[PDB]
């Protein structure tokens, strides 16, 4: 209890707010967020490193790769320990950032709090290996909006 915010803006013509809350620390986070301005259709939804950069992105590459994680969507068994998967945007570019993972947290350390959430150009791969960058990171396509997570109580 106590919410983190990620105001996602980055650089693309997108604007949104993640509201991260959970009962516990060691328990499943209830992600809800109301992102808009995306292009239509599927959009990868990944949390890259990028802590104390400036405010938003400046800096990050992979989906918080500790050494050699593999990609996977929600449905997959695996994932980088900074990807959830994707969302779908309607037409006002409005996505529905409703996720409930059981691996991450919003406490600290292995939590994703502090990290830069990113909304991406294409769908993520889901862990099929459409190509290869697929498994290596997730082949989301380019970064659009982003922001450091944690900015509430
Ligand atoms: Zn990934």
UniProtKB/Swiss-Prot annotation:
Spell out which residues are annotated as carrying N6-acetyllysine: 122, 136
Q: Which reaction does it catalyse?
A: 2 superoxide + 2 H(+) = H2O2 + O2
Give me the residues lipidated as S-palmitoyl cysteine: 6
Q: How is the cofactor bound?
A: Binds 1 copper ion per subunit.
Q: Which cofactor does it need?
A: Cu cation; Zn(2+)
The residues that the entry says bind Cu cation are 46, 48, 63, 120
Q: What is the effect of changing residue 85 to R?
A: In ALS1; ubiquitinated by RNF19A; interferes with zinc-binding; ubiquitinated by MARCHF5; leading to the degradation of mitochondrial SOD1
Q: Which GO terms describe its molecular function?
A: copper ion binding; identical protein binding; protein homodimerization activity; protein phosphatase 2B binding; protein-folding chaperone binding; small GTPase binding; superoxide dismutase activity; zinc ion binding
Outcome of mutating residue 146 to S, per the record?
A: Enhances formation of fibrillar aggregates in the absence of bound zinc
Locate the cross-link: 1-(tryptophan-3-yl)-tryptophan (Trp-Trp) (interchain with W-33): 32
Related illness: Amyotrophic lateral sclerosis 1: A neurodegenerative disorder affecting upper motor neurons in the brain and lower motor neurons in the brain stem and spinal cord, resulting in fatal paralysis. Sensory abnormalities are absent. The pathologic hallmarks of the disease include pallor of the corticospinal tract due to loss of motor neurons, presence of ubiquitin-positive inclusions within surviving motor neurons, and deposition of pathologic aggregates. The etiology of amyotrophic lateral sclerosis is likely to be multifactorial, involving both genetic and environmental factors.
Q: What does this protein do?
A: Destroys radicals which are normally produced within the cells and which are toxic to biological systems.
Its quaternary organisation is: Homodimer; non-disulfide-linked. Homodimerization may take place via the ditryptophan cross-link at Trp-32. Heterodimer with SOD1. The heterodimer CCS:SOD1 interacts with SLC31A1; this heterotrimer is Cu(1+)-mediated and its maintenance is regulated through SOD1 activation. Interacts with DAOA; the interaction is direct.
- Protein name, entry field: Superoxide dismutase [Cu-Zn]
């Amino acid at each position: 209890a106590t919410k983190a915010v990620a105001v996602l803006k980055g650089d693309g013509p997108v604007q949104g707010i993640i509201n991260f809350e959970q009962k516990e620390s060691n328990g499943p986070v209830k992600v809800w967020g109301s992102i808009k301005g995306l292009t239509e259709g599927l959009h990868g939804f990944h949390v890259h490193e990028e802590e104390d950069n400036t405010a938003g992105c400046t800096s990050a590459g992979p989906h918080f790769n500790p050494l050699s994680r593999k990609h996977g969507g929600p449905k997959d068994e695996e994932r980088h320990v900074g990807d959830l998967g994707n969302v779908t945007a309607d037409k006002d570019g409005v996505a529905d950032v409703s996720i409930e993972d059981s691996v991450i947290s919003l406490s600290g350390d292995h939590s994703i709090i502090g990290r830069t959430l990113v909304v991406h150009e294409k769908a993520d791969d889901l862990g099929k290996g459409g190509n290869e960058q697929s498994t290596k990171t997730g082949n989301a396509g380019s970064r659009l909006a982003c922001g450091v997570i944690g900015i509430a109580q």
